[PDB]
From a paper:
Our data show that the evolutionarily conserved UBR4 complex forms a megadalton E4 arena, in which inward-facing ZZ-DZB domains of KCMF1 act not as E3 ligases but as substrate receptors. The architecture of the E4 megacomplex is conserved across eukaryotes, but species-specific adaptations allow UBR4 to perform its precisely tuned quality-control function in diverse cellular environments.
Cryo-electron microscopy analysis of UBR4 in complex with its cofactors KCMF1 and CALM1 reveals a massive 1.3 MDa ring structure, featuring a central substrate-binding arena and flexibly attached catalytic units. Two UBR4 molecules dimerize through two remote, structurally different interfaces to form a large ring-shaped assembly. The second, larger interface is formed by Armadillo repeats in the C-terminal portion of UBR4, with laterally aligned helices sealing this contact. CALM1 and KCMF1 bind at this C-terminal interface, as predicted for the trimeric sub-complex. The C-terminal helix of KCMF1 inserts like a pin into a hole in the UBR4 Armadillo repeat and is covered by a small lid insertion within this region, which also mediates CALM1 binding. This arrangement implies that the proper folding of the Armadillo repeat scaffold and its associated lid depends on KCMF1.
Numbering used by the authors:
A (entry chain E): 9 to 57, 63 to 76, 82 to 149
B (entry chain A): 3983 to 4079, 4088 to 4339, 4475 to 4515
C (entry chain C), D (entry chain D): 289 to 296, 300 to 331
E (entry chain B): 3463 to 3647, 3698 to 3775, 3788 to 3842, 3849 to 3982
The structure:
Amino acid sequence: QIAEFKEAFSLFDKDGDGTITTKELGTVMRSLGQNPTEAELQDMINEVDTIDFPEFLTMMARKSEEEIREAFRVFDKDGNGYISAAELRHVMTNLGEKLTDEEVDEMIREADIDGDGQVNYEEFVQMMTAK
Amino acid sequence: DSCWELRLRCALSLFLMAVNIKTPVVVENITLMCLRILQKLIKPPAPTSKKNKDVPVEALTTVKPYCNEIHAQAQLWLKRDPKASYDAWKKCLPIRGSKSELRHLYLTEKYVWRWKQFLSRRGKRTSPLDLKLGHNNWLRQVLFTPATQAARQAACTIVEALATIPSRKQQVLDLLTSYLDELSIAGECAAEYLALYQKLITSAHWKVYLAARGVLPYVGNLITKEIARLLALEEATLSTDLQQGYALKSLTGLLSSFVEVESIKRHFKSRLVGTVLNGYLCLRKLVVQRTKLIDETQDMLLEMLEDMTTGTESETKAFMAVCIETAKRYNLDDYRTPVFIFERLCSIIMAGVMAQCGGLECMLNRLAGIRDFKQGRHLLTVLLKLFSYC
Amino acid sequence: SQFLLTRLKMSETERQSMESERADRSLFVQELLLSTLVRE
Amino acid sequence: SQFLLTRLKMSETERQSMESERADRSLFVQELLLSTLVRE
Amino acid sequence: RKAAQFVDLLGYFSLKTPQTEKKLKEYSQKAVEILRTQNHILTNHPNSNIYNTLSGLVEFDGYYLESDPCLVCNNPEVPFCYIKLSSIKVDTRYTTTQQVVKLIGSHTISKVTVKIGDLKRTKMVRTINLYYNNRTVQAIVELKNKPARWHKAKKVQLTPGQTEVKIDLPLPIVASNLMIEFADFFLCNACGFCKYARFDFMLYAKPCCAVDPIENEEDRKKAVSNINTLLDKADRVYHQLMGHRPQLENLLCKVNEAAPEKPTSASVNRYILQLAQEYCGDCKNSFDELSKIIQKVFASRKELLEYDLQQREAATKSPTFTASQYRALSVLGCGHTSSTKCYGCASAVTEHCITLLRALATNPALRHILVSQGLIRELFDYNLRRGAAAMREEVRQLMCLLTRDNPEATQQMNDLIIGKVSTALKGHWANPDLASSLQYEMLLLTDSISKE
Ligand SMILES: [Zn+2]
């Protein structure tokens, strides 16, 4: 598996110095069968950063419950452990999406099994693990 | 006007109902008009407002399409589905607008996408299509139609406009690359399509991306197949074709374009020397079915061979090995190509490497196969010269 | 030129609105055409 | 005139029969046409 | 169009030989399959629309919008003609007892009639020797050299007092320069005036496309360079010819509208005049030049290939072939094949198919098998409206014959006619061309009824 990544890195290596530019970073794993997003790309640039082979391999190896916990923390701005419809509306507005009050309420309600009209950490964990 | 959607639906229904008919009268009288309508709708007139005198069309949209999904669905739209209308589609797109902010945006977008996917999977929300383009469609039919050139030009403009954001451009380039094998069947009618393709890969990173996907062996195989067909036709008949060598010329030009830049030239030289050398020899064999296009193809192939044969010792040894490999297949009766191979070897002289690769027995058998002197003076001279060199 | 019937203007803000609407109509037609080329 | 395929007679009794049959066909067509002009 | 006699004999023999039902079924299947394939080729041809529209407006002989020129259609059978030698002359030189002449180009000479006027008893010619060669030179004195560069053609002896002599050539000769020698018994060395007699020459010749032969290596190099020049010129002319198509399609689109225009040979619609001028005026000239250059290239290639074969054989002589293998290998079987995408050749094949099917249908059993193949619908849908008027009438006759005594076939044909007429008459009110494009269906009905 390392051979394909090495071949792609070398093929995208311009000056032959074993290092590439971050402007072409998305194209390297775009050619490998994976499809990233722009936000993913800026996040990957932020995490590491010109990239050499070791950092590229580290990035590829990470292509965890810590991520789910961080997402839950980002969703619950107040830190109260409960995701209200207001918090979801604020998150959607920040992301740029447009939604109705009825649609968001229905989304929250369909995300609750306990009938309390609220999202818990266990509920989000179960929703994420649904296959 | 405000009823534009119904007119567009009529035009698109007529287009898709009459896009697969090969008769030239239908292409000229129905498909061309729908293509022109679609081309006018896709590419609107340049803005005249004082603020927007400079910015292009892409800078004017109030919504931003998603990277890896298509929300518009033509199958339901053509059946007058209220849930797949223009306003419904526009309502599903987001309005155009430190490390922690980047992270938070990343996870919010990702898990909101997952939440929406689950909602569509269990509930009633419509599921967007995936951006994976099929390789057989009406697009190949329209792009190479010999009925009329204007239809090809309009289709080229449409597909050029379809590739603006790189997420769509990747798929568009993949489909166009898949359409590469139509060059031989539709020799001159492809003149437009090529002009589009070269424009879409005019940047270096797109060429490198296509090279990483394995396009160089594809073009090489196409070139060898075309040269073999040319040789077979030359052997049998004596017809004249004013378009002979167009497809081979175009494919060789495309290969040279792929090779000109440094990275793929350095990487892919070890796999392309045999193809180019064999093609050059086979083209040089032509004596009657020879045109100007074939002459230019031979010249460019020779230039490519000269360019690739410059490097370190390992690459020179590999080139010698493949040169002996191509010398092996040629029979013992022809006295032209081995002369070229051996004078090339003596010019590059290396003297002991064929002892390691085992090419000595090849030239020993070459000496053993000579039964005449009048017709084999050049081969004997070059073989003796290289034997004294070695 | 003396016929009255043959003689039977737009501000700037509505010009901006029209250009924007042209942009979204172009984008919608692009996505509609892309939808018909998906793999089946 | 040398083509063979371009060259690819009737007695008197069958001529009489043909003329008679023509007569009855004419009469039948006459009556058929008269049938469409009746009162309604 | 070369296979008229072949299909004639095939139809006759199939009609005369009694055969099993399986052989008849196979034969009918082959005929119908060829017909269907040619119809499919014709209806999808890229130039089909242009030719179909042009047929009813202008009068044109050939199809001058073909990408690959067809050797069969480019090579008609040209007959011999009587040409006076002075009309094709270019340069001449006289000596004491010989005359050397050069022509404009190559010619296939068959007979020479020589006339004598103002003869005197002092001296006349007893033996005339004819010499010819096909090597093009710029100066006559250069070719004046006697022994090496001439070929014997004919020696003719004359009775005393002869006035006209008929030098016949058993085999026609392809010549560019000629020489006449007075062997047994005069001419001015500078001007060529003869006081004893006056000589006039006639030839039974026709224009010929041929090139100089190759004998050595520099001749091969000159041939290669000339062929490259001819290929370049042909490419330029071909591009100039194919550049005419967009204008032709624009004019066709404008003509199809048929808008009335306000203003007797000048009162015809201006767009029709432009169409005729564009097609029959410019495309025809470009096509003729292209055909000439293609013929020259073909002749040069044939000469070069023959020289290469001879040289290879000479080198190898320092394998028996049967009679058919010799023809297959040699240059004899090289120039009698039509291009694959040719409109005229497909039309000719459809004509032959119609003729053969008309011959075959005269057998009742073959008629039943053909109607079982589904020939009536194919003829109704494709060949009723395409071709010359004679072909259309022949197709009508064949369709009438196929239903001669078959109630089912007659019902099928009547159903087709009635359905088309009703469908057209439904929308006749909103479009009169529907009502005016029923002439062939009604002609078919008239022809079927008129045959008792
Ligand atoms: Zn032809």
